[PDB]
Design a protein around this ligand. Structure first.
Ligand SMILES: NC(=O)c1ccc[n+]([C@@H]2O[C@H](COP(=O)([O-])OP(=O)(O)OC[C@H]3O[C@@H](n4cnc5c(N)ncnc54)[C@H](OP(=O)(O)O)[C@@H]3O)[C@@H](O)[C@H]2O)c1
Ligand SMILES: CN(O)C(=O)CS[C@@H](c1ccccc1)P(=O)(O)O
Ligand SMILES: CN(O)C(=O)CS[C@@H](c1ccccc1)P(=O)(O)O
Ligand SMILES: [Mn+3]
Ligand SMILES: [Mn+3]
Lengths: 402, 409
């Protein structure tokens, strides 16, 4: 029996997590939903608490803490432990009745729950790429201290990579550890991309696209359009699997059947395939190193018929190159990249800047950043990341305001 | 350091095996070639003995035993143990200085070396599909007796399937063992096929194709027998049965898929419905290497797969009307008993008849069908030696029956 807590349960990731748990429990009682955690969606959480009856309920916004208490009681025969804010978050992570934690909180924010889950030596099913990109060094340091804690990737491409690996080798190491690619005999990674909605547009057409043309969460949807998502996923790949940037190739695969591929040192390539869906990577992160039966629609390769692959144009998608450059430079440049992107993404979402202004703002912030001495100790490293994150957001806003 | 013997070293598999060993040895000394074995190609064996200097040389044909002795003389600082026939084959398999045996002997003949390799608890890198199809039951029984022996698949599609599995689960079982697919969480297998040279022909055009049309242009130099089997898709039918025995997968869970680009070599659907596939250019060096490095991988200097360059991958269902051999293989597999032995033996005759322009394309399937129809299931022998003789007799019977049907025309 696998005891699970879902963080950000009303979100895209959270809903899909409960969907696959529900379906798999119809076949065999494998999962127990022990805790649910949201921001302010009280009504949606009440509805989820009805079906799964978790031991713990938690909401971040304390102002809606009373509303949740009233909605619970009429559910007969249930008394849950209702908690709030960061302290409730911490109590869930320290519980001995929980083995695996799904982090479905979006943006840089998700880092707090990730660290507490690691500190308590839990399996962390991490969908939040932002925390890996801004705080890869910090997570690596933390996973070194808390030796039983593990991050299992949920982002579809990184889940595919992880599925392609030999668990006989994976068990000798873990994600976000030095030497991961050497132990797993990894030579090269093909990181597949849908290409997003703007893939077939000219430079002239690109220069006038809007948020409407681009519009998953609204944030990841814009990132998909600029191919900044794939840029962030390159850095994510580097941290999770210890693969060199010169060994990661972005490939546009518009059918989204092959989710990513791993080239091993003998040059044999292994890839994971399925329909575009998040239930598989969520499930695997919870069943690893085993697999369990599902009633999901089987892949029909004859029906799919055709799979295509081509290189992305770096001229049309300058965000990709910026992410490689920030990754290669190392230090806190990926933190800066992520923070400046958050601002520029939102400005484009609200029709304040143009498409090529996104990469332009990000480039200027990166140029203005100077490498910093990396703090030796974990608490000081975390504060450093927060300050540099904050600085880069402010810098990006300032470039916009001039 | 991995000590290897190559059986059928001058053939297509054998040459590709020595090619990848040579290349890998330039990076680091990982392989030692301990023995080479051929049928009658003395001159090609001498040339191979020059480069690899194996401890053992063996040839089956005793009439060219004297010619080899004189030639090894040209090669200096080399005094190898030169052997002959089945006896020499057995001495190589019983040597303690050999860990892995590559079986690249073609046809039903390859079964003898396969059994002695198993009897001596060796790792057997088996490319010969005929032995698995005619004697799957026997090999399963033999692997149960010799618990340290393992067959590692070399046939590209079966190697791909094997590469797609988690070695953390593979190590708890072995190929050709009951419950293999349950332990490995296998739900379904996509068995990819090139489709061969006749894939886009109509029924009318098929009805008049010849061995020349089938042989002229392959991906690489393959044997004449496997080329014809490729053209009729009987190769894939044999590979279906091979998949069933190697991985304990039900026939209703094996789907043949035509993939003309031959980049994806096969796919495994697991019980959660996630699919894993192995990809590379069409080449035998990878599956040969992996069979010798398993459960590890080693560095090569092979050309990296360029997916953007490949650009397009296509998939479609094969037409059973155009390729009746596929259905016949399923039917023989499903019936079980010695029907796959009969299928293989009748095909060997019909393949050769079509190769020598004696029968037409559809006559291949017609002769095989008639032989299968005439066969009655036999009580399966309990003991391994008697089972082997039973297989040989049925093999022989089916070849004679196929020739007899041909002669009543
Ligand atoms: N060719 C491929 O790419 C490929 C791919 C998958 C599977 N396979 C399978 O692998 C096997 C080999 O195929 P192939 O194309 O390499 O055939 P091949 O090119 O014609 O080579 C056959 C080899 O076996 C040797 N041999 C034959 N009979 C023997 C006997 N009674 N005793 C000792 N040695 C004997 C031959 O010796 P001589 O040279 O002295 O005549 C030769 O070295 C077949 O089962 C084939 O279907 C092959
Ligand atoms: C799913 N998943 O990990 C994303 O990251 C969402 S966005 C990516 C995607 C992937 C699959 C379908 C559509 C879009 P991208 O367009 O390739 O960046
Ligand atoms: C290599 N390999 O496993 C064979 O079995 C040889 S024949 C097959 C093949 C597969 C790949 C390229 C060419 C030919 P088929 O045409 O799909 O049967
Ligand atoms: Mn992704
Ligand atoms: Mn094959």
């Amino acid at each position: 029996p696998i005891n699970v807590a879902i963080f950000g349960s009303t979100g895209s990731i959270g809903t899909n997590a409960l969907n696959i748990i529900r379906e798999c429990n119809k076949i065999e009682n494998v999962f127990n939903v022990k805790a649910l955690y949201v921001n302010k969606s009280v009504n949606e959480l009440y509805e989820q608490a009805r079906e799964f009856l978790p031991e713990y309920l938690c909401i971040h916004d304390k102002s809606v803490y009373e509303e949740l208490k009233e909605l619970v009681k009429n559910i007969k025969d249930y008394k849950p432990i209702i908690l709030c804010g960061d302290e409730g978050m911490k109590e869930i992570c320290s519980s001995n009745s929980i083995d695996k934690i799904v982090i479905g909180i979006d943006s840089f924010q998700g880092l707090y729950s990730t660290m507490y889950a690691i500190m308590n030596n839990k399996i962390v099913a991490l969908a939040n790429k932002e925390s890996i990109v801004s705080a890869g060094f910090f997570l690596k340091k933390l996973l070194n201290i808390h030796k039983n804690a593990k991050i299992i990737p949920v982002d579809s491409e990184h889940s595919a990579i992880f599925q392609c690996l030999d668990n006989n080798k994976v068990l000798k190491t873990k994600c976000l550890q030095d030497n991961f690619s050497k132990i797993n005999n990894i030579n090269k990674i093909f990181l597949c991309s849908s290409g997003g909605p703007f893939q077939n547009l000219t430079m002239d057409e690109l220069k006038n696209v809007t948020s409407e043309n681009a519009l998953m969460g609204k944030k990841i949807t814009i990132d998909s359009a600029t191919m900044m998502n794939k840029g962030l996923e390159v850095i994510e790949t580097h941290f999770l699997f210890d693969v060199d940037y010169n060994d990661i190739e972005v490939i546009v695969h518009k059918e989204c059947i092959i989710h990513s591929c791993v080239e091993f040192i003998d040059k044999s390539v292994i890839s994971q395939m399925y329909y575009p869906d998040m239930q598989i990577p969520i499930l695997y992160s919870l069943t690893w190193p085993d697999r369990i039966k599902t009633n999901l629609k089987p892949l029909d390769l004859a029906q799919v018929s055709t799979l295509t692959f081509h290189k992305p144009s770096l001229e049309h998608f300058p965000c990709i190159k910026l992410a490689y450059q920030a990754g290669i430079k190392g230090n806190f440049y990926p933190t800066v990249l992520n923070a400046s992107n958050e601002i520029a993404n939102n400005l484009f979402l609200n029709n304040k800047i143009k498409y090529f202004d996104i990469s332009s703002i990000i480039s200027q912030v990166l140029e203005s950043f100077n490498s910093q001495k990396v703090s030796e100790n974990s608490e000081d490293l975390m504060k450093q990341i927060l300050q540099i994150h904050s600085w880069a957001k402010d810098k990006a806003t300032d470039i916009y305001n001039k």
